[PDB]
Amino acid sequence: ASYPLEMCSHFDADEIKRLGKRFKKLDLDNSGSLSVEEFMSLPELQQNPLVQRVIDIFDTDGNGEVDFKEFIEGVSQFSVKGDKEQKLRFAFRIYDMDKDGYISNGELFQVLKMMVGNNLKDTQLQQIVDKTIINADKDGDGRISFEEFCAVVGGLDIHKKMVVDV
Amino acid sequence: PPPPPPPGADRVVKAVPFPPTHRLTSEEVFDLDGIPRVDVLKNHLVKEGRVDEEIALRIINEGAAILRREKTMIEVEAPITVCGDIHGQFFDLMKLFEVGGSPANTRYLFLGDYVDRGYFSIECVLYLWVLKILYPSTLFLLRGNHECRHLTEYFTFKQECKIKYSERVYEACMEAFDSLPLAALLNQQFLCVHGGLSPEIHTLDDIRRLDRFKEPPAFGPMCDLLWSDPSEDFGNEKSQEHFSHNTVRGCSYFYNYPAVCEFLQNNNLLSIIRAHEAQDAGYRMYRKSQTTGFPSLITIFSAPNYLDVYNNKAAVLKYENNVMNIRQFNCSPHPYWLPNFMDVFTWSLPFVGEKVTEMLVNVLSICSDDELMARVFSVLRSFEEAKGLDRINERMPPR
Ligand SMILES: [Ca+2]
Ligand SMILES: [Ca+2]
Ligand SMILES: [Ca+2]
Ligand SMILES: [Ca+2]
Ligand SMILES: [Fe+3]
Ligand SMILES: [Zn+2]
């Protein structure tokens, strides 16, 4: 009889139970945590360039794996009940690698590089990164806050795509 | 409390020049007399700098006021440097002036199309307008078919203005373009125009008469001056028909050699100098008049490696000491922009959204009613090959 897990999410008891079943089946060695290697054992994830970024965001305690609390709170960002700001903040977090709350030049480059590969020259990519920052940086520190990020993309309605059924 | 890290601390490609963060102010651009400092402006623009909006407006509006008081067919004498299409290729424009000579001691005539296709159109406009403000009697600008509401709204110039400046700046450019003269008579011997002839234009007086202060209409003499082309078989035609419907442009006409001959002879002209069509060599000399032995028609094209894919030379025409000498030049490096000026967030976000959601869908699909019991992201996009591929963009946009 272990201690209750505490979490915050949009899910009712039934949904948490169903997610629990998925968690267990994903947890191959049954350690109660989810390793990178366990995520990668799903062939459909092997060519997805954002997998490690998603895992980093889910792993809020930073021990390199995703436990059940983190799994629930991660998936909850994609609940149909989640708001625009929530989906957008998750998107912001894809770019914000070191999690300090500001997208920097180097991070924007690196994350774009993960997605673009060799479709652009490094010089080209640096130039569009530079201009994106300049155009979106409203207080002149050279990096992009969440507020400045939303002012740019909040009209795109991408949040309406970031939704899964559980 | 430690300050932020230096702006370019974690920047990955450090050798790449970083654009200025501050817009040029009025104090910096305009001297004590209200005169613009062209070298201050040029240096800033070459670094991809911007100006304060009020300065952009001031430059555009003053240029417009000067242009508006010119005749619709201006008269200019030799010596002169005549230039064709520029198409927003600002960094090539810089080379053009190095080749042609400084406007401080060199007379210039531009045949239009300053904007669209290239992603530095506004910089081209600001810089040429400033030169017009500084040298109103030695540098001249004509209207091209792209200097209008219809084309800039279809192509990227309107979006360029919205992103770098505002719709106010775009609207100011539209009024300024309405003021551009339609033609130049050079040294009483050459008619210079962007496109060419019209079945409704038989004398210079037909041009002088035109009300130019308007959007170019879809047909008629003003339209034709900006839009018409020599026929593909110019000088070697089967039919003797002077004009035929321009199937390439979707409007206006092809004019043939007989049509040009008649016009030259009726008006005591030596040649027509025009632009409007890309040339591998930067220019084309068409069939010589039997009478004079001089090229009846000349096309000049001043945008090298047009669209970054044509690989063509550019040229300007220098008319001095009774010699017309063509000076060719090659393209110059320029900074990169994503298609239609989109920032990388706008570019990448749909892909991010799609891929993270796909991952989660796959992750959650690990059970199926058991509970009841490269990197795949890309951009957004020979002379004769480039031409055929870009054929639809030479045609007039719908409505
Ligand atoms: Ca495990
Ligand atoms: Ca963890
Ligand atoms: Ca950061
Ligand atoms: Ca900032
Ligand atoms: Fe053109
Ligand atoms: Zn043209």
Coordinates of C-alpha atoms and ligand atoms in Angstrom, one line a residue:
Chain A
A1 CA 0.0 0.0 0.0
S2 CA 2.2 2.8 -1.3
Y3 CA 1.7 6.6 -0.8
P4 CA -0.7 8.4 -3.2
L5 CA 0.7 10.2 -6.2
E6 CA -0.1 13.8 -6.4
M7 CA -0.6 15.6 -9.8
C8 CA -2.5 18.3 -11.6
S9 CA -4.3 17.4 -14.9
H10 CA -7.6 17.7 -16.8
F11 CA -8.3 13.9 -16.5
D12 CA -11.1 12.2 -14.6
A13 CA -10.6 8.9 -12.7
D14 CA -11.4 6.7 -15.7
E15 CA -9.0 8.5 -18.0
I16 CA -6.2 8.4 -15.4
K17 CA -6.9 4.6 -15.2
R18 CA -6.7 4.1 -18.9
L19 CA -3.5 6.1 -19.1
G20 CA -2.2 4.0 -16.2
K21 CA -2.7 0.9 -18.4
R22 CA -0.8 2.5 -21.3
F23 CA 2.0 3.5 -18.9
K24 CA 2.4 0.0 -17.5
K25 CA 2.5 -1.6 -21.0
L26 CA 5.1 1.0 -22.1
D27 CA 7.2 0.3 -19.0
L28 CA 9.0 -2.8 -20.3
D29 CA 11.2 -3.6 -17.4
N30 CA 8.4 -2.5 -15.1
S31 CA 10.5 0.0 -13.1
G32 CA 7.7 2.6 -12.7
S33 CA 9.6 5.0 -14.9
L34 CA 9.9 5.4 -18.7
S35 CA 13.3 5.5 -20.3
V36 CA 14.3 7.0 -23.6
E37 CA 15.0 3.5 -24.8
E38 CA 11.4 2.4 -24.0
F39 CA 10.0 5.3 -26.0
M40 CA 12.3 4.4 -28.9
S41 CA 11.2 0.8 -28.8
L42 CA 8.1 2.1 -30.6
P43 CA 9.1 1.9 -34.3
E44 CA 6.7 4.8 -35.3
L45 CA 8.8 7.1 -33.0
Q46 CA 12.2 6.2 -34.5
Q47 CA 12.1 8.8 -37.3
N48 CA 10.3 11.6 -35.3
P49 CA 12.9 14.3 -34.8
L50 CA 11.1 15.9 -31.8
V51 CA 10.9 12.8 -29.6
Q52 CA 13.7 13.7 -27.2
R53 CA 12.4 17.3 -26.9
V54 CA 9.0 15.9 -25.8
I55 CA 10.6 13.6 -23.3
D56 CA 12.7 16.5 -21.9
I57 CA 9.5 18.5 -21.4
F58 CA 7.6 15.6 -19.8
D59 CA 10.6 14.9 -17.4
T60 CA 9.9 17.8 -15.0
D61 CA 12.2 16.4 -12.2
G62 CA 15.1 16.1 -14.7
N63 CA 16.2 12.5 -13.9
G64 CA 16.1 11.6 -17.6
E65 CA 13.0 9.4 -17.3
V66 CA 9.2 9.9 -17.3
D67 CA 7.4 8.5 -14.2
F68 CA 3.6 8.2 -14.0
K69 CA 3.0 11.7 -12.6
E70 CA 5.0 13.3 -15.4
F71 CA 3.3 11.1 -18.0
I72 CA -0.2 12.2 -16.9
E73 CA 0.8 15.9 -16.7
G74 CA 2.5 15.7 -20.0
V75 CA -0.4 14.1 -21.8
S76 CA -2.8 16.6 -20.1
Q77 CA -1.2 19.4 -22.1
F78 CA -2.9 17.8 -25.1
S79 CA -6.3 17.2 -23.5
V80 CA -9.3 18.4 -25.5
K81 CA -10.1 20.3 -22.3
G82 CA -6.8 22.2 -22.3
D83 CA -6.7 25.9 -23.2
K84 CA -5.0 27.8 -26.0
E85 CA -2.3 29.2 -23.7
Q86 CA -1.5 25.7 -22.4
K87 CA -0.9 24.3 -25.9
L88 CA 1.1 27.4 -26.8
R89 CA 3.3 27.1 -23.7
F90 CA 4.1 23.5 -24.5
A91 CA 5.1 24.7 -28.0
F92 CA 7.2 27.4 -26.4
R93 CA 8.9 24.7 -24.3
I94 CA 9.9 22.7 -27.4
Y95 CA 12.2 25.7 -28.3
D96 CA 13.2 26.6 -24.8
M97 CA 15.8 23.9 -24.3
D98 CA 17.4 24.9 -21.0
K99 CA 13.9 25.7 -19.5
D100 CA 14.8 29.2 -18.3
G101 CA 11.7 30.8 -19.7
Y102 CA 13.3 32.6 -22.7
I103 CA 14.0 31.3 -26.2
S104 CA 17.6 32.2 -27.1
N105 CA 19.2 32.6 -30.5
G106 CA 21.3 29.4 -30.1
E107 CA 18.3 27.3 -29.0
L108 CA 16.1 28.5 -31.8
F109 CA 18.8 27.5 -34.2
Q110 CA 19.5 24.1 -32.6
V111 CA 15.8 23.1 -32.4
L112 CA 15.2 24.3 -36.0
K113 CA 18.3 22.4 -37.1
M114 CA 16.8 19.2 -35.6
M115 CA 13.8 19.7 -37.9
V116 CA 15.4 21.2 -41.0
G117 CA 18.5 19.1 -41.3
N118 CA 20.4 20.0 -44.4
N119 CA 17.5 21.6 -46.2
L120 CA 19.1 25.0 -45.4
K121 CA 22.7 26.1 -45.1
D122 CA 23.8 26.9 -41.6
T123 CA 24.4 30.5 -42.7
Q124 CA 20.9 30.8 -44.1
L125 CA 19.4 29.3 -41.0
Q126 CA 21.4 31.7 -38.8
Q127 CA 20.2 34.7 -40.8
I128 CA 16.5 33.8 -40.5
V129 CA 16.9 33.0 -36.8
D130 CA 18.6 36.4 -36.3
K131 CA 15.8 38.3 -38.0
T132 CA 13.0 36.4 -36.3
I133 CA 14.5 37.3 -32.9
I134 CA 15.1 41.0 -33.9
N135 CA 11.5 41.3 -35.2
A136 CA 9.9 39.6 -32.2
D137 CA 12.2 40.9 -29.4
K138 CA 10.2 43.7 -27.8
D139 CA 12.5 44.6 -24.9
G140 CA 15.9 44.2 -26.5
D141 CA 17.7 41.4 -24.5
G142 CA 18.2 39.3 -27.6
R143 CA 16.0 36.4 -26.5
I144 CA 12.2 35.6 -26.8
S145 CA 9.9 35.5 -23.8
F146 CA 6.6 33.5 -23.8
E147 CA 4.7 36.8 -24.2
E148 CA 6.7 37.7 -27.3
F149 CA 6.4 34.2 -28.7
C150 CA 2.5 34.4 -28.4
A151 CA 2.4 37.8 -30.1
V152 CA 4.0 36.1 -33.1
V153 CA 2.1 32.8 -33.4
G154 CA -1.1 33.2 -31.3
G155 CA -3.1 33.8 -34.5
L156 CA -2.0 30.6 -36.2
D157 CA -4.5 28.3 -34.4
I158 CA -2.0 25.5 -34.2
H159 CA -3.3 24.9 -30.6
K160 CA -6.4 23.4 -32.2
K161 CA -4.2 20.6 -33.7
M162 CA -2.4 19.7 -30.5
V163 CA -5.0 17.4 -29.1
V164 CA -5.3 13.7 -28.5
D165 CA -8.0 11.3 -27.2
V166 CA -7.3 9.2 -24.2
Chain B
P1 CA 21.9 40.4 -9.7
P2 CA 23.7 39.2 -12.9
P3 CA 22.8 41.0 -16.2
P4 CA 21.4 38.9 -19.1
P5 CA 24.0 36.9 -21.0
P6 CA 25.5 38.9 -23.9
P7 CA 22.9 38.8 -26.8
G8 CA 25.1 36.6 -29.1
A9 CA 26.4 34.3 -26.4
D10 CA 25.0 31.0 -27.5
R11 CA 24.7 32.0 -31.2
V12 CA 25.7 29.1 -33.3
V13 CA 27.2 30.5 -36.5
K14 CA 29.1 33.4 -34.9
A15 CA 30.8 34.7 -38.1
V16 CA 27.5 35.6 -39.7
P17 CA 26.9 39.4 -39.6
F18 CA 24.1 40.3 -37.2
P19 CA 21.7 43.1 -38.4
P20 CA 21.4 46.3 -36.4
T21 CA 18.7 46.2 -33.7
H22 CA 18.0 50.0 -33.8
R23 CA 16.1 51.8 -36.5
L24 CA 17.8 54.8 -38.0
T25 CA 16.3 58.0 -36.6
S26 CA 15.4 61.3 -38.3
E27 CA 18.3 63.1 -36.6
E28 CA 20.6 60.5 -38.2
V29 CA 19.1 60.5 -41.7
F30 CA 18.3 64.1 -42.3
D31 CA 20.9 67.0 -42.1
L32 CA 20.2 70.5 -40.8
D33 CA 18.6 71.6 -44.1
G34 CA 16.2 68.6 -44.2
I35 CA 18.4 66.9 -46.8
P36 CA 18.9 63.1 -46.5
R37 CA 22.3 61.5 -45.9
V38 CA 22.5 58.9 -48.7
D39 CA 25.7 57.2 -47.4
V40 CA 24.3 56.9 -43.8
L41 CA 21.2 55.3 -45.3
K42 CA 23.1 53.0 -47.7
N43 CA 25.4 51.7 -45.0
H44 CA 22.5 50.9 -42.7
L45 CA 20.4 49.2 -45.5
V46 CA 23.4 47.1 -46.7
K47 CA 23.5 45.7 -43.1
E48 CA 19.7 45.0 -43.3
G49 CA 19.0 47.9 -41.0
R50 CA 15.6 49.6 -41.0
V51 CA 14.5 53.2 -40.6
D52 CA 11.8 54.6 -38.3
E53 CA 8.5 54.5 -40.0
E54 CA 8.1 58.3 -40.2
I55 CA 11.4 58.5 -42.1
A56 CA 10.3 55.9 -44.6
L57 CA 7.1 57.9 -45.1
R58 CA 9.0 61.1 -45.4
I59 CA 11.4 59.7 -48.0
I60 CA 8.6 58.1 -50.1
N61 CA 6.3 61.2 -49.9
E62 CA 9.1 63.7 -50.8
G63 CA 10.2 61.5 -53.7
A64 CA 6.5 61.3 -54.8
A65 CA 6.1 65.0 -54.8
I66 CA 9.2 65.5 -57.0
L67 CA 8.0 62.8 -59.4
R68 CA 4.5 64.1 -59.6
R69 CA 5.7 67.4 -61.0
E70 CA 7.6 65.8 -63.8
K71 CA 6.1 65.3 -67.3
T72 CA 4.7 61.9 -68.2
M73 CA 7.2 61.7 -70.9
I74 CA 10.3 63.4 -69.5
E75 CA 13.1 64.6 -71.7
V76 CA 16.7 63.7 -70.9
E77 CA 20.0 64.2 -72.7
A78 CA 23.2 62.2 -73.0
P79 CA 25.5 61.4 -71.4
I80 CA 23.4 58.9 -69.4
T81 CA 23.2 55.4 -67.9
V82 CA 20.0 53.5 -68.7
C83 CA 18.9 50.6 -66.4
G84 CA 16.3 48.0 -66.7
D85 CA 14.5 45.8 -64.1
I86 CA 15.8 45.7 -60.6
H87 CA 13.2 43.6 -58.9
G88 CA 14.1 44.2 -55.3
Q89 CA 17.7 42.9 -55.7
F90 CA 19.2 45.7 -53.5
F91 CA 22.6 44.1 -53.2
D92 CA 22.8 43.9 -57.0
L93 CA 21.6 47.5 -57.1
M94 CA 24.7 48.4 -55.1
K95 CA 26.9 46.7 -57.7
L96 CA 25.0 48.5 -60.5
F97 CA 26.0 51.9 -59.1
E98 CA 29.6 50.8 -58.6
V99 CA 29.7 49.7 -62.3
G100 CA 27.6 52.7 -63.6
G101 CA 29.2 55.4 -61.6
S102 CA 28.2 57.5 -58.5
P103 CA 25.0 59.4 -59.0
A104 CA 26.9 62.5 -57.7
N105 CA 28.5 62.8 -61.1
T106 CA 26.6 60.4 -63.2
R107 CA 23.2 60.8 -64.9
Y108 CA 20.8 57.8 -64.6
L109 CA 17.5 56.6 -66.1
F110 CA 15.7 53.6 -64.6
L111 CA 13.0 51.9 -66.7
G112 CA 10.9 50.6 -63.8
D113 CA 10.2 47.4 -61.8
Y114 CA 12.0 48.3 -58.6
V115 CA 9.9 45.9 -56.5
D116 CA 8.6 42.3 -56.3
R117 CA 10.4 39.0 -56.8
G118 CA 13.4 40.1 -54.8
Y119 CA 13.0 40.4 -51.0
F120 CA 14.8 43.8 -50.7
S121 CA 12.2 45.8 -52.6
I122 CA 11.5 48.4 -49.9
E123 CA 15.3 49.0 -49.6
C124 CA 15.5 49.6 -53.3
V125 CA 12.6 52.1 -53.1
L126 CA 14.0 54.0 -50.1
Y127 CA 17.5 54.3 -51.7
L128 CA 16.3 55.3 -55.2
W129 CA 13.9 57.8 -53.8
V130 CA 16.6 59.4 -51.7
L131 CA 18.8 59.6 -54.8
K132 CA 15.8 61.2 -56.5
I133 CA 15.5 63.7 -53.7
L134 CA 19.2 64.5 -53.8
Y135 CA 19.7 64.6 -57.6
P136 CA 16.2 65.5 -59.0
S137 CA 17.7 66.8 -62.4
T138 CA 20.2 64.0 -63.1
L139 CA 18.6 60.8 -61.9
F140 CA 15.3 59.7 -63.4
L141 CA 12.8 56.9 -62.6
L142 CA 10.1 55.5 -64.9
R143 CA 7.1 53.3 -64.0
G144 CA 7.3 49.6 -64.6
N145 CA 4.4 47.2 -64.7
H146 CA 5.1 46.0 -61.1
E147 CA 4.7 49.6 -59.7
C148 CA 1.0 49.2 -59.0
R149 CA -1.5 47.9 -56.5
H150 CA -2.5 44.8 -58.6
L151 CA 0.9 43.2 -58.9
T152 CA 2.4 44.1 -55.5
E153 CA -0.7 42.6 -53.8
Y154 CA -0.3 39.5 -55.8
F155 CA 3.4 39.2 -55.4
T156 CA 5.3 39.9 -52.2
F157 CA 5.8 43.7 -52.0
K158 CA 2.7 44.4 -50.0
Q159 CA 3.7 41.7 -47.5
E160 CA 7.2 43.0 -47.4
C161 CA 5.9 46.4 -46.3
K162 CA 3.6 45.0 -43.7
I163 CA 6.5 42.9 -42.2
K164 CA 9.3 45.4 -42.3
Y165 CA 7.3 48.7 -41.9
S166 CA 3.5 49.0 -42.2
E167 CA 0.5 49.3 -44.5
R168 CA 0.9 53.1 -44.2
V169 CA 4.3 52.7 -45.9
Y170 CA 2.8 50.4 -48.6
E171 CA 0.0 52.9 -49.2
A172 CA 2.5 55.7 -49.5
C173 CA 4.4 53.7 -52.1
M174 CA 1.2 53.2 -54.1
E175 CA 0.7 57.0 -54.4
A176 CA 4.4 57.5 -55.2
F177 CA 4.2 54.9 -57.9
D178 CA 1.1 56.6 -59.4
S179 CA 3.4 59.6 -59.8
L180 CA 6.2 57.9 -61.8
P181 CA 6.6 59.2 -65.4
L182 CA 5.7 56.6 -68.1
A183 CA 8.4 57.3 -70.7
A184 CA 11.5 59.3 -71.5
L185 CA 12.7 60.8 -74.7
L186 CA 16.5 60.5 -74.7
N187 CA 18.5 63.0 -76.7
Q188 CA 15.6 63.5 -79.1
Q189 CA 16.5 60.1 -80.6
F190 CA 15.4 57.2 -78.3
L191 CA 12.0 56.5 -76.8
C192 CA 12.5 54.8 -73.4
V193 CA 9.7 52.9 -71.8
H194 CA 9.3 49.8 -69.6
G195 CA 7.3 47.6 -72.0
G196 CA 6.8 49.1 -75.4
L197 CA 4.2 50.2 -78.0
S198 CA 0.4 50.2 -78.2
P199 CA -1.9 50.0 -81.2
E200 CA -3.4 53.2 -79.7
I201 CA -0.1 55.1 -79.6
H202 CA 1.1 56.5 -82.9
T203 CA 2.9 59.7 -81.9
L204 CA 4.8 61.0 -78.9
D205 CA 1.9 63.3 -78.2
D206 CA -0.3 60.2 -77.6
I207 CA 2.1 59.5 -74.7
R208 CA 2.4 63.1 -73.4
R209 CA -1.4 63.3 -73.3
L210 CA -1.9 60.4 -70.8
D211 CA -3.3 60.8 -67.3
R212 CA -0.7 58.7 -65.5
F213 CA -1.9 59.4 -61.9
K214 CA -3.8 56.1 -61.3
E215 CA -3.6 52.4 -61.1
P216 CA -2.8 51.1 -64.6
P217 CA -6.0 49.9 -66.2
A218 CA -6.3 46.4 -67.6
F219 CA -6.2 47.6 -71.2
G220 CA -5.5 50.8 -73.2
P221 CA -2.4 52.9 -74.0
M222 CA -1.1 53.2 -70.4
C223 CA -1.4 49.5 -69.9
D224 CA 0.4 48.7 -73.2
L225 CA 3.4 51.1 -72.5
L226 CA 4.0 49.1 -69.3
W227 CA 3.1 45.6 -70.5
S228 CA 3.8 45.0 -74.2
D229 CA 6.6 42.8 -75.6
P230 CA 8.3 42.3 -78.9
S231 CA 6.9 39.2 -80.6
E232 CA 9.0 36.0 -80.2
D233 CA 9.9 36.1 -83.9
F234 CA 10.6 39.9 -83.9
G235 CA 12.3 40.9 -87.2
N236 CA 11.6 37.6 -88.8
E237 CA 7.8 37.4 -88.7
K238 CA 5.5 35.5 -91.1
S239 CA 2.4 37.6 -90.7
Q240 CA 2.8 41.3 -91.2
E241 CA 0.2 42.1 -88.5
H242 CA 1.5 45.0 -86.4
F243 CA 0.1 43.8 -83.0
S244 CA -1.3 40.5 -81.7
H245 CA -2.6 39.5 -78.3
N246 CA 0.2 38.9 -75.8
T247 CA -0.3 35.3 -74.8
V248 CA 2.6 35.4 -72.3
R249 CA 1.3 38.4 -70.3
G250 CA -2.4 37.5 -70.5
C251 CA -3.0 41.2 -71.4
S252 CA -1.8 43.8 -73.8
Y253 CA 0.1 43.0 -77.0
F254 CA 3.1 41.6 -78.9
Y255 CA 4.5 44.2 -81.2
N256 CA 6.3 43.2 -84.4
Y257 CA 9.1 44.8 -86.4
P258 CA 6.8 46.5 -88.9
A259 CA 5.0 48.2 -86.0
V260 CA 8.3 49.4 -84.6
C261 CA 9.6 50.6 -88.0
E262 CA 6.4 52.6 -88.6
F263 CA 6.6 54.2 -85.2
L264 CA 10.3 55.2 -85.4
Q265 CA 9.9 56.7 -88.9
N266 CA 6.7 58.6 -88.1
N267 CA 8.3 60.1 -85.0
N268 CA 11.9 60.7 -86.3
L269 CA 13.3 58.2 -83.7
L270 CA 16.3 56.0 -83.9
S271 CA 15.3 53.2 -81.5
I272 CA 13.1 52.1 -78.7
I273 CA 14.9 51.3 -75.4
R274 CA 12.9 49.1 -73.0
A275 CA 13.1 46.4 -70.3
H276 CA 10.5 44.0 -69.0
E277 CA 12.0 40.8 -70.3
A278 CA 14.9 38.8 -68.7
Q279 CA 18.0 38.3 -70.9
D280 CA 20.8 35.8 -70.4
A281 CA 23.3 38.5 -71.4
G282 CA 21.6 41.3 -69.5
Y283 CA 20.5 42.9 -72.8
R284 CA 19.3 42.3 -76.3
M285 CA 19.8 44.2 -79.6
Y286 CA 17.0 43.4 -82.0
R287 CA 16.9 43.7 -85.8
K288 CA 18.5 46.8 -87.3
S289 CA 16.5 49.3 -89.3
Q290 CA 17.2 49.0 -93.0
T291 CA 17.4 52.8 -93.2
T292 CA 19.8 53.6 -90.3
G293 CA 21.6 50.4 -89.7
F294 CA 20.9 50.9 -86.0
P295 CA 19.0 48.4 -83.7
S296 CA 15.3 49.2 -84.0
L297 CA 14.7 47.9 -80.5
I298 CA 16.8 47.3 -77.4
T299 CA 16.0 45.4 -74.2
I300 CA 18.0 46.2 -71.1
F301 CA 17.8 44.0 -68.0
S302 CA 19.6 44.9 -64.8
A303 CA 18.8 42.0 -62.4
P304 CA 21.6 39.4 -62.5
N305 CA 20.9 35.8 -61.4
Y306 CA 17.2 36.8 -61.4
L307 CA 15.1 35.0 -58.8
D308 CA 18.5 33.4 -57.7
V309 CA 18.0 30.8 -60.4
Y310 CA 18.3 32.4 -63.8
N311 CA 22.1 32.7 -63.7
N312 CA 21.9 35.6 -66.2
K313 CA 24.2 38.6 -66.4
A314 CA 22.8 42.0 -65.8
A315 CA 23.6 45.1 -67.9
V316 CA 23.2 48.9 -68.0
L317 CA 23.5 50.9 -71.1
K318 CA 25.9 53.8 -71.1
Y319 CA 25.3 56.5 -73.8
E320 CA 28.3 58.9 -73.9
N321 CA 30.3 60.7 -76.6
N322 CA 28.0 59.2 -79.3
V323 CA 28.7 55.7 -78.2
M324 CA 26.2 53.3 -76.7
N325 CA 28.3 50.9 -74.6
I326 CA 26.7 48.0 -72.7
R327 CA 28.3 47.3 -69.4
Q328 CA 27.5 43.8 -68.0
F329 CA 27.9 42.6 -64.4
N330 CA 27.3 39.5 -62.3
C331 CA 25.2 38.9 -59.2
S332 CA 26.4 39.7 -55.6
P333 CA 25.7 37.7 -52.4
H334 CA 22.6 38.7 -50.5
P335 CA 21.1 37.6 -47.1
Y336 CA 18.5 34.9 -46.9
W337 CA 14.8 35.3 -46.2
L338 CA 12.1 32.6 -46.0
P339 CA 9.4 32.8 -48.7
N340 CA 6.9 35.6 -48.1
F341 CA 9.0 36.9 -45.2
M342 CA 7.7 34.4 -42.6
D343 CA 9.6 34.2 -39.4
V344 CA 10.9 30.8 -38.2
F345 CA 8.2 30.4 -35.5
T346 CA 5.5 30.8 -38.1
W347 CA 7.5 28.5 -40.4
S348 CA 8.2 25.7 -37.9
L349 CA 5.2 25.7 -35.5
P350 CA 2.8 23.7 -37.8
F351 CA 5.5 21.1 -38.0
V352 CA 6.2 21.0 -34.3
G353 CA 2.5 20.8 -33.6
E354 CA 2.1 17.9 -36.1
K355 CA 5.1 15.9 -34.9
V356 CA 4.5 16.1 -31.1
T357 CA 0.8 15.2 -31.5
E358 CA 1.7 12.3 -33.8
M359 CA 4.2 11.1 -31.2
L360 CA 1.6 11.2 -28.5
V361 CA -1.0 9.5 -30.7
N362 CA 1.4 6.7 -31.3
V363 CA 2.4 6.4 -27.6
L364 CA -1.3 6.2 -26.6
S365 CA -2.1 3.7 -29.3
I366 CA 0.0 1.1 -27.3
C367 CA -3.3 -0.2 -26.0
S368 CA -6.4 -0.6 -28.2
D369 CA -9.6 -1.2 -26.1
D370 CA -7.4 -3.2 -23.7
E371 CA -8.3 -0.5 -21.2
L372 CA -12.1 -1.2 -21.6
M373 CA -11.2 -4.7 -20.6
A374 CA 16.6 15.8 -44.2
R375 CA 14.6 15.2 -41.0
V376 CA 11.3 15.7 -42.9
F377 CA 11.0 19.5 -42.7
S378 CA 11.7 21.7 -45.7
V379 CA 11.3 25.2 -47.0
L380 CA 8.1 26.5 -48.8
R381 CA 9.3 26.6 -52.4
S382 CA 19.6 26.8 -67.0
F383 CA 18.1 30.1 -68.3
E384 CA 15.5 28.5 -70.6
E385 CA 14.5 26.1 -67.7
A386 CA 14.1 28.9 -65.2
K387 CA 12.1 30.9 -67.8
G388 CA 9.6 28.1 -68.5
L389 CA 9.1 27.4 -64.8
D390 CA 8.5 31.0 -64.0
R391 CA 6.1 31.6 -67.0
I392 CA 2.9 32.1 -64.9
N393 CA 4.5 34.9 -62.9
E394 CA 5.1 37.0 -66.0
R395 CA 1.4 37.0 -66.6
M396 CA -1.1 39.6 -65.2
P397 CA -2.8 38.4 -62.0
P398 CA -6.6 37.8 -62.1
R399 CA -8.9 40.8 -61.8
Ligands
CA1 CA 11.3 1.5 -17.3
CA2 CA 11.4 12.0 -14.3
CA3 CA 16.2 29.2 -22.8
CA4 CA 12.9 39.9 -25.0
FE5 FE 10.2 42.6 -64.6
ZN6 ZN 8.1 44.1 -66.4

